[PDB]
Amino acid sequence: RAIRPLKLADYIGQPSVREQMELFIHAARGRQEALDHTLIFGPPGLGKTTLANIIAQEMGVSIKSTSGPVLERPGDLAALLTNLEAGDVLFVDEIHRLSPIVEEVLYPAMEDFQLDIMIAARSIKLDLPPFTLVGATTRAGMLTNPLRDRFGIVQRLEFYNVEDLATIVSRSAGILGLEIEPQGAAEIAKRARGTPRIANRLLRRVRDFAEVRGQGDITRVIADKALNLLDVDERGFDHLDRRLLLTMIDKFDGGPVGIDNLAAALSEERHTIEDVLEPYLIQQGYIMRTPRGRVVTRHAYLHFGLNIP
DNA sequence: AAAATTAATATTAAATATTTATTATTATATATTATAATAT
């Protein structure tokens, strides 16, 4: 029972990007040709395979959702391409982790749909039917320059707009059956943390709060009562984050810090911090990073009235 | 003297197919080495 819009117009969250890719879909449909290669990158976990399946039903063809471990050997991908047909498409994931032998096999596969292979050297030339190679990675920066320059469509995925996050909150609460408020929708959009999954988790938890504290009612006051104590903040801070900030600023006064020293002093190993708490705050930019220590920026000083050295 | 020939004549005995320590050689994090700026 996962959250999934049925259609591309039904897909809501990136309206300009949705219109762009709808234009690409109608370009594939009208031209009666396989759609160009689409590069996809952005958030790591977003259910991209399901969206590729939706694109498959929009094309009406089959897309083999494949990844790096699936296509780590060139033989497996060659076999899948041989079972691929005209007008079909192949979802590819973890292209960055894939071996360069895969890259050289996929050079002629998209280069006008051919295949060249060596056998005292003898050359064997093979052909491939036209198709839509789909390349989606968590990060596209590791893609090699000739390969990415030879591609066609490049599409970016990102967390939704705050008003559009609020609309997604409203739709998911209607799916979940929660009697949510537009003020509460904007509240959870401010709490969306850039992640739809943790957003839906917050909808579930405020639904539980409205069930056990209110009379099944989600309002702005109910949402504030649910999300203004413990690891919460209107911007996205936690009391873990506030503790980290306070412990950095009382010790080193916004100066260079030792990461092992921080892990020892906080009674909290630095690994989880740099895995969840630090990357979000640096995603907001609020911590500036040095090779001699992580320091918060002027935003955190303005949060607590602190000076600037 | 000095090497080649041959008839007795005592002598010797037939074990393969498998198997496990005993050597090769192939990754994989992880406690090392390292640099850069930085106060004092």
User: A293: which nucleotide lies closest, measuring CA to C1'?
Assistant: B37
A190-225: burial string, b at 16+ Cβ within 10 Å, e else: bbbbebbeebbebbeebbebbeeebeeebbeebbee
Q: Is the distance from CB of A98 to CB of A48 less than 8 angstroms?
A: no
Q: Which residues contact residue A303 at a Cβ distance below 8 angstroms, ignoring those fewer than 6 apart?
A: A245
What interhelical angle do A74-83 and A100-110 show, nearest 10?
20
**Amino acid sitting at position A195:** T
C-alpha to C-alpha distance for A32 and A34, rounded to whole angstroms: 7
A231-255: burial string, b at 16+ Cβ within 10 Å, e else: eeeeebbbebbeebbebbbeeeebe
Is A111 assigned a ligand-binding role in the annotation? yes
Q: Is the distance from CB of A25 to CB of A180 less than 8 angstroms?
A: no
**Cβ-count burial of A44 within 10 angstroms (0-12 exposed, 13-18 middle, 19+ buried)?**
exposed
Q: Which of A93, A132, A207, A241 is catalytic?
A: A93
- Residue A7 approaches strand B within 7 Å at CB: no
Specify whether the backbone of A269 is left (phi greater than 0), alpha (psi in -120 to 50) or beta.
beta
C-alpha to C-alpha distance for A56 and A58, rounded to whole angstroms: 5
Is A18 assigned a ligand-binding role in the annotation? no
Q: Given the DSSP bridges, would you call strands A123-127 and A114-118 parallel, antiparallel or unpaired?
A: antiparallel
What interhelical angle do A196-212 and A182-190 show, nearest 10?
130
Q: Is A156 helix (H, G, I), strand (E, B) or coil?
A: strand
Is A48 assigned a ligand-binding role in the annotation? yes
Q: Given the DSSP bridges, would you call strands A293-296 and A287-290 parallel, antiparallel or unpaired?
A: antiparallel
Q: Is A147 helix (H, G, I), strand (E, B) or coil?
A: helix
Integer CA distances (angstroms), A132 to A87, A89, A155, A175, A264, in order: 7, 4, 14, 33, 52
Integer CA distances (angstroms), A294 to A182, A222, A267, A270, A275, in order: 38, 36, 18, 12, 14
Residues (247-306, chain A) with CB within 7 Å of strand B atoms? 256, 290-292
Q: Is the distance from CB of A46 to CB of A3 less than 8 angstroms?
A: no
Question: What was the structure determination method?
Answer: cryo-EM
C-alpha to C-alpha distance for A273 and A268, rounded to whole angstroms: 8
